[PDB]
Design a binder for this molecule. Sequence first.
Ligand SMILES: O=C1N[C@H](O)C=CN1[C@@H]1O[C@H](CO)[C@@H](O)[C@H]1O
Ligand SMILES: O=C1N[C@H](O)C=CN1[C@@H]1O[C@H](CO)[C@@H](O)[C@H]1O
Ligand SMILES: [Zn+2]
Ligand SMILES: [Zn+2]
Lengths: 294, 294
Amino acid sequence: MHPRFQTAFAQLADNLQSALEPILADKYFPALLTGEQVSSLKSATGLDEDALAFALLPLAAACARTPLSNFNVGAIARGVSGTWYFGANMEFIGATMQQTVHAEQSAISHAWLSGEKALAAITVNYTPCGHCRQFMNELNSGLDLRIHLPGREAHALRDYLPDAFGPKDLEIKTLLMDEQDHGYALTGDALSQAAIAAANRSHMPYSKSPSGVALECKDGRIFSGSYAENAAFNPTLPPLQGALILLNLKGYDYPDIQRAVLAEKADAPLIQWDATSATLKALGCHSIDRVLLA
Amino acid sequence: MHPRFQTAFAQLADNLQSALEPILADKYFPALLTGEQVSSLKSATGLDEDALAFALLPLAAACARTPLSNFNVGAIARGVSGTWYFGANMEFIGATMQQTVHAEQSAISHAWLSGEKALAAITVNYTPCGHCRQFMNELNSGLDLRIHLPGREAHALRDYLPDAFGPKDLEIKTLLMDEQDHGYALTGDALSQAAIAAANRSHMPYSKSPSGVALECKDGRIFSGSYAENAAFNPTLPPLQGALILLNLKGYDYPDIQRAVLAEKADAPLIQWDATSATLKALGCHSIDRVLLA
Ligand SMILES: O=C1N[C@H](O)C=CN1[C@@H]1O[C@H](CO)[C@@H](O)[C@H]1O
Ligand SMILES: O=C1N[C@H](O)C=CN1[C@@H]1O[C@H](CO)[C@@H](O)[C@H]1O
Ligand SMILES: [Zn+2]
Ligand SMILES: [Zn+2]
């Protein structure tokens, strides 16, 4: 089992531990659970979903990277698929606060990127900051998203975000997790195509600047991120971050990053380039290439 | 009167117009009103503060810069001083969504930077996004801040941000607008010192990386911004933005920017440098210098 889970795992309940140990066994346990696993989990313990999710939090939080805060936050997004995706915050020393990733964004994009069509609920070990409540309201699940916090009843997003601002305010009709395909031709090597492919699924109704980032690991593994705009602009999820979320959740570490490509239009109104390299360099990867969309 | 106000002004009520015209007369009307002016305003019209603020919105919104959205948002922060500060959103073509400024952040930092000790209320022509509700909760006014929106009753922040996350969650005791002075020696030319001075008032309890940006205009005017962290990290106000807010509100335009300096520690965990130049270049200023704090 991935050491990141060591401690957490140890404070889990005996029957839960047993049910889990087989799954967590793999270092490369993908920080996710299929329906089937959930069911199994539910039988070995007498937990109901909600209780199960709360019970897994600490594992989701085990994946956090917080050199600054030291404030571990885990989240679990529940697919309409039955799959549960873990999420955890990340802070990058050498960059800016604007580069940070919240547990919630982590889980939701984990899910989105993985192909999930919609979420039903999300569970966090801490009340969501306003930045995340706003991030949440961009999804096709709307104000209905259900949110579970420890020691609280469940509530819909609408309750956490009264009189909310969202895509409708801007006359935006396509929501995050809705089906998208911008249609750019994939070209170049693998990495280039992984980037372009991500740019293709990007959510960018406000600025109309598609973008994607793909990261190649030592072992030739390839994690890629899609750009995700937000109505309030600022909470937008830059493409780099997408990739790093996957990369981390999945058991990898920065240093395993071999090379990275970024794809975008040259003439787009918004430009990912600088923030991408910068942060990437901050992480120690100077191998950045960019590919121009068309 | 600054053309930016032309249209707005024209749809104001006759008695309000009259009361205003003398003030708005100056191109360099500083997008702000002293107590005295407010009083005068109140007498010429029979308005009460709240109604007065709602009535001035469109002027606050006249100051917006929205090449992307085209979504003008104005805000008015009311000092405990009796001074009212205007605010408006800004979007920068060529940068990223994370560089955007919300009307609310604009007003609050307008006030903060101007020396305001605390706010009593804020009025916006649109419901605040979650990013701003979060930004608001960093102030020393806490959940008590009062918020006025058109067609709604007033409410405290707590109402817009139920079960909120904030500085206390991180054990942070110094709030934004509280009195701060990091104690760096001012040095170099004017610009350098303006930068350092700003770095000195910066709010950075989470990362501990002070920073400041000062901009010199053609005419030798100098606008400077202070760094403002936020508990949720992301909503943090980078130092550059500070300066540009003032610069815009005050009647200036990008192209009047002559040179700019940024001050920060070299070894800080967070680094403003890249985002600063980048955006600055995006705006057409390549004249960036950095000064190392100590
Ligand atoms: O991850 C979350 N989610 C919740 O909305 C609130 C806060 N945090 C975060 O937890 C840390 C403290 O702000 C940061 O890494 C920031 O991303
Ligand atoms: O300025 C605000 N304040 C409110 O919290 C909500 C939205 N906007 C903004 O208005 C525009 C649309 O998102 C952007 O410039 C963004 O900064
Ligand atoms: Zn958050
Ligand atoms: Zn806002």
